[PDB]
Design a protein around this ligand. Structure first.
Ligand SMILES: NC(=O)C1=CN([C@@H]2O[C@H](COP(=O)(O)OP(=O)(O)OC[C@H]3O[C@@H](n4cnc5c(N)ncnc54)[C@H](OP(=O)(O)O)[C@@H]3O)[C@@H](O)[C@H]2O)C=CC1
Ligand SMILES: NC(=O)C1=CN([C@@H]2O[C@H](COP(=O)(O)OP(=O)(O)OC[C@H]3O[C@@H](n4cnc5c(N)ncnc54)[C@H](OP(=O)(O)O)[C@@H]3O)[C@@H](O)[C@H]2O)C=CC1
Ligand SMILES: NC(=O)C1=CN([C@@H]2O[C@H](COP(=O)(O)OP(=O)(O)OC[C@H]3O[C@@H](n4cnc5c(N)ncnc54)[C@H](OP(=O)(O)O)[C@@H]3O)[C@@H](O)[C@H]2O)C=CC1
Ligand SMILES: O=C(O)c1cccc(C(=O)O)c1
Ligand SMILES: O=C(O)c1cccc(C(=O)O)c1
Ligand SMILES: O=C(O)c1cccc(C(=O)O)c1
Lengths: 459, 459, 459
């Protein structure tokens, strides 16, 4: 009767719900409508005040959150976002998505998300430390290795994970896998930094192989990426390793595009990584080598990369939600883009999704642009967090090769599940690619819904 | 301003600190001096009264301790010592060492140590049971499988571990890996009894192979060992298995030396083991066969074995701290000893260490006596305890061969790390052996210090 | 066998033990020797590292302690001392005393003591806040309204209690009487600030009334006080209210003596109170009015007040332990002092006590100087803390008059108990005053010892 407006959450919900309705799911099992009503209300939300001291001795106040959305498949799992936009609506969209993403990994992880409106930009490392100490002082009451296992989303790196982990141990007096994205000597997993970007690229490899009947791969393709943080960096590295070209990165202030044919180099990605560790903008490094080379790089203030990259074969938005508009989607199609996968959560606007999906239904086979939703394509991060949990519970670390192999198998299974599910419940016209968004949504949702029923959450 | 004098702890600290100062560590990273000040104050110490009833019905009072020194790398881990010398100073030296030893294993274990001034000698098994029951009644508030995992050091065998484990389960109502050194049917690990002695010998094998360019091994070498408990027994067995000769054992009342050329036999080690299970002295068994054979054995009351064994190639003090004096170190050098490794914690006096290290810097290659500190060489015990924890968390036991293989890999990695670290930070003159004490200390310390920084313990 | 030297604790123990031996206690009940051995080993001690951030952003490290000595009569109870001298020995002397003091109040409070070597002098309020936050972050694991209830001893005021209480609530998520000395709006008791000083004076009133057969009182008497903190301030105020003269106060840097006949005024005590709130020395206020008036005040740097006050009738050391030497005791006797009561814990050296007691046995009636130990005379503070606990458990505050009346009854009962106990177990020669130190010690000890036996601590 009197619920507040939560636009981001409503967007995520509406897209999921629409894909479920536009299938035979509720014809065969109309009772699953009850599951949808129940699943869409989070099990628990904690909000709390975070008072912390700045370097001048002043009192500062921020808001802390943890949404514990669903635990049918496992303990709550998902990142912490420290960004000035953060509110309950955003964290609910993220936590809702997380439920179904986690289901697609095949691991036992429920969905959650948290964070704060604290803005790490402009803060000293000391200020970030004090903030994390205050934040976890409250959060540690509500989380635990078999309860809720956070990690780092936007604004939360290994640095923040460390300060958070330290304070948890201090209060709780237990050394356990309560956070993932931990450091190598204190319970971290090899491949976790790489996991999301690598996984997105692994997933798109299956998309390319399927759409082109094994004729094409990333070798020789031009890939536009947005963001320049954890997901963007490692997606870029994997593309390069597979012989593809990375033709854009961006941040909140502008885009850094490759001028003509060519690619970001691993060395350049490393320099950008070090800049971002220091919480600096791409704009701050384009006045010196190598990024001042105007024949290789064009910095465009205030722009997203999509309309400025020219011809592209693959688009991997890897920054933030709603970062590909309807217009930009049409431009990418016109630029020859045949593959778009979300590194970022809810990276595409609804207008963009509708554009990509309309295009898929109008164009046979490899002529279609194929859209993969984040809950499928970006699941590598949380999957590898699941493996970090597994390693922590075994008290033994695995090799890079072991973790990467499992990650590859998970991304393959996720792709196949979404493809086959779409084929069965939302069968496309002959020659048309099945909807990976529809298939992924149905596959994630039904697994969760049935587990919920088994456990008496609904009946 | 008004801190008490803790001689053993101060000794351990001073030796660590000196080795760090005599390197390039603080030239490259002077901030690590802050880490040293923080790490050297234990996170937590619990002391408690232990009232227990003797077989006559009398009230008896002893003191109980658990030092929880550092948890950056994992839950607190280290043994319990029941010996009349026990006090906070001793347990702090042991727990401080434990931090860096544990770091060298590559497993996620923090450093701790505890115990009591209770003297098991002269007690009935019933008295030991009542004492352990009382002791754990308090200790169980402070320990746990993800918090602090004790085990048996001097005076604490599988018998005491059993009584302790029983009482923990009774109160806490959890069956978990809270202690290691457990029995085979109730969560123990194969190879744990053997682990420390085997590991010391494994480590020395790498020392011999490196110093002699693969030309020598334990085959044909004469090895003087002190103590006759868990570490000494299994070190002796491994030496014998590798074709070496064990020419001494000792206890608190005297030494039992091999008279001439020859060795303790596995059968004789077993008889000594059974004597020690009964808490009897070596002096009590030399009046009968086989130990009354004066052509094989000489019992020397009140003596350590070092000056009485004649020519020796390897010395493995395996009893207690400060059991090789400056004089005894010179005698071992004069007797041709080229390898000395601590089975016992802080087995060498500082005078001994200085003598061994001066000798190493004065003599090229295989001419030097090479000293390996306990934190490197005796780490096999705690390593295998880590694997017992891993097995308990998996709910499945491993084979003897699996545990032993991992132990071998751990001792190899520990040796290599200490060797290469010494080579990099405290580079010896050409032809001179790198300092394993310096390398081990730097390698353990930096790993802990950096994890502490990551977790906000210092900044 | 290998226990560390704890001089202050040994002093407290030896004096108690001597008074018990010099009585008929162990003739009638020799089994109580067993009780003494058990009671003298603390039930539990927690020590912990306290890392805190100074105003420059530097890491600082101090040591934290809580001695939980005895809980036969109630939850552990006693103050926190923040002073650079603090170590385990000091806190054990204090906690040991606390057991028997608490027993004499008639309330259900066990004995404990804690604190830190942190020195509040030279720190900002912000630094003190950060220190208290860090300190309680660990201490809150070990204390609670029905477990252990600390409060403020030397260096710990209502300010520090507030910061400590805040952090406890933050972590533990319980609002309860875990600390006493709390503020008026957040669970404090009327009369708690006044309690110790008032109580000392109340107790001495009974001493005067008894020794002089009701002929004298505080009216017209000259009272030398040491210290200028909580105990000294309110002892001074009560003396003034009863028509006595306060002729000295002191701090760690010197004494401020009344020059001739006259008294500190309540207004002057208030100014000194405000100076001490700011953590400043008496030396800093003698350069201005009213304390620059050399006809009223003499400031003597580096001196205790005892030899500089001339003729005095009552001495109330109210600063710290061992602050009246053997010499100073003889001087006070020579100055006509007939009443000495410890505001401070273990205020008198053993030499002083022996001097006062020898004098009592050599001089009949009112000719003797009468010594009252702190465990009797300074018990008003902890008694009123007991009433603060009672008020917190009732969820209702009492009036100033209610609390003060109970305090008066408690001090009367304590005096009577010590007097009558001395009369029964250590009967003085006819005309000689009974030993209040002996009587107080026996009365406190037997109550605790018998409760311990009832509860199975010894048998
Ligand atoms: N890390 C992981 O494992 C997972 C991440 N994701 C999602 O990937 C995306 C990126 O996360 P991640 O790389 O880890 O985060 P990072 O903080 O490391 O990087 C985020 C990047 O996106 C930019 N960005 C963030 N918010 C905005 C915004 N409101 N407007 C414009 N630009 C913005 C940032 O620019 P700037 O520096 O200027 O602010 C930065 O370049 C997110 O949507 C995240 O939820 C999905 C699955 C796993
Ligand atoms: N057990 C393990 O896994 C580990 C042990 N260590 C260290 O190895 C050493 C031996 O431990 P462990 O074998 O397990 O213990 P045990 O109790 O099984 O045996 C100890 C041996 O050393 C003698 N000993 C102990 N204390 C003294 C003392 N003050 N003076 C003279 N002799 C003494 C004992 O003689 P007696 O019987 O007469 O008292 C006994 O022979 C210790 O320093 C221990 O800390 C190091 C790493 C792992
Ligand atoms: N507060 C209470 O309710 C109780 C207190 N006590 C005892 O009363 C005595 C005073 O405590 P309290 O008034 O509360 O504490 P405060 O900190 O308020 O005042 C302590 C006074 O004693 C001085 N002082 C403290 N330590 C030393 C030292 N080593 N050497 C010289 N002077 C020193 C201080 O001088 P400066 O400022 O220069 O350091 C100050 O004037 C202590 O012995 C305490 O244990 C006994 C029963 C109850
Ligand atoms: O649980 C995680 O490791 C994690 C961290 C950051 C983002 C995500 C996500 O799936 O969006 C998960
Ligand atoms: O943790 C252990 O298993 C243990 C037991 C005895 C000694 C030691 C040690 O490293 O000294 C560890
Ligand atoms: O428990 C208390 O309130 C307290 C505070 C300060 C000192 C004392 C004491 O008895 O010495 C008690």
């Amino acid at each position: 009767s009197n619920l507040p407006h939560e636009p981001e959450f409503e967007q995520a919900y509406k897209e999921l719900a629409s894909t479920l309705e536009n299938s035979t799911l509720f014809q065969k099992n109309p009772e699953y409508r009850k599951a949808l009503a129940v699943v869409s209300v989070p099990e628990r939300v904690i909000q709390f005040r975070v008072v912390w001291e700045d370097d001048a001795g002043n009192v500062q106040v921020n808001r802390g959150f943890r949404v514990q959305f669903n635990s049918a498949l496992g303990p709550y799992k998902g990142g912490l976002r420290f960004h000035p936009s953060v509110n309950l609506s955003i964290l609910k969209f993220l936590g809702f998505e997380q439920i179904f993403k986690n289901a697609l990994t095949g691991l036992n992880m429920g969905g959650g998300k948290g964070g704060s409106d604290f803005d790490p930009k402009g803060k000293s490392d000391n200020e970030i430390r004090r903030f994390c100490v205050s934040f976890m002082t409250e959060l540690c009451k509500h989380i635990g290795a078999d309860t809720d296992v956070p990690a780092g989303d936007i604004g939360v790196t290994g640095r923040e994970v460390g300060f958070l982990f330290g304070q948890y141990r201090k209060i709780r007096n237990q050394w356990e896998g309560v956070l993932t994205g931990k450091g190598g000597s204190w319970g971290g997993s090899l491949i976790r930094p790489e996991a999301t970007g690598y996984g997105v690229v692994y997933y798109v490899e299956h998309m390319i192989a399927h759409a082109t009947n094994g004729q094409e791969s990333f070798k020789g393709k031009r890939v536009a990426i947005s963001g320049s943080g954890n997901v963007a960096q490692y997606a870029a590295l994997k593309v390069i390793e597979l012989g593809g070209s990375v033709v854009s990165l961006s941040d909140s202030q502008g885009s850094l595009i490759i001028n003509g044919e060519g690619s970001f180099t691993p060395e350049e990605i490393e320099l950008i990584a070090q800049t971002k560790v220091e919480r600096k903008q791409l704009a701050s490094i384009v006045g010196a080598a190598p990024f001042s080379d105007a024949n290789k790089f064009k910095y465009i203030a205030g722009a997203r990369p999509w309309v400025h990259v020219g011809k592209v074969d693959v688009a991997l938005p890897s920054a933030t939600q709603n970062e590909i508009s309807g217009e930009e989607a049409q431009v990418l199609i016109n630029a020859g883009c045949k593959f778009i996968a979300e590194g970022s959560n809810m990276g595409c606007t609804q207008e963009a999704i509708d554009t990509f999906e309309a295009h898929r239904t109008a164009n046979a086979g490899a002529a279609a642009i194929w859209y993969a939703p984040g809950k499928a394509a970006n699941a590598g991060g949380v999957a590898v967090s699941g493996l970090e949990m597994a390693q922590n519970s075994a008290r033994l670390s695995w090799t890079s090769e072991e973790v990467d192999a499992r990650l590859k198998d998970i991304m393959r299974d996720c792709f196949k599940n979404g493809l086959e599910t779409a084929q069965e419940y939302a069968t496309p016209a002959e020659g048309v690619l099945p909807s990976l968004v529809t298939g992924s949504n149905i596959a994630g949702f039904t697994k969760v819904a049935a587990a919920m029923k088994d456990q008496g959450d609904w009946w």
